[PDB]
Amino acid sequence: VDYIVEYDYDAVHDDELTIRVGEIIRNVKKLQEEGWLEGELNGRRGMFPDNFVKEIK
Ligand code: NA
Numbered sequence: 001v002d003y004i005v006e007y008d009y010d011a012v013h014d015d016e017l018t019i020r021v022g023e024i025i026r027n028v029k030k031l032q033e034e035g036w037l038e039g040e041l042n043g044r045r046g047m048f049p050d051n052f053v054k055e056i057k
Pocket of ligand 1 (some may be wrong): 043
């Protein structure tokens with residue numbers, strides 16, 4: 001499942017992904033923590049909040 005980034009988000013720690021409007025995050029998985037997803041961008045995996053992105057269907 002891929003997601004499209006709809007709002008910029010900036011990582012505040014290493015395990016988070018910095019993401020930018022229009023980029024596709026690939027292979028997104030849900031986390032135990034509510035409000036957070038994990039996925040791959042540009043060869044790197046990290047988490048980010050789910051309100052910045054939209055599931056591509
Ligand atoms: Na690259």
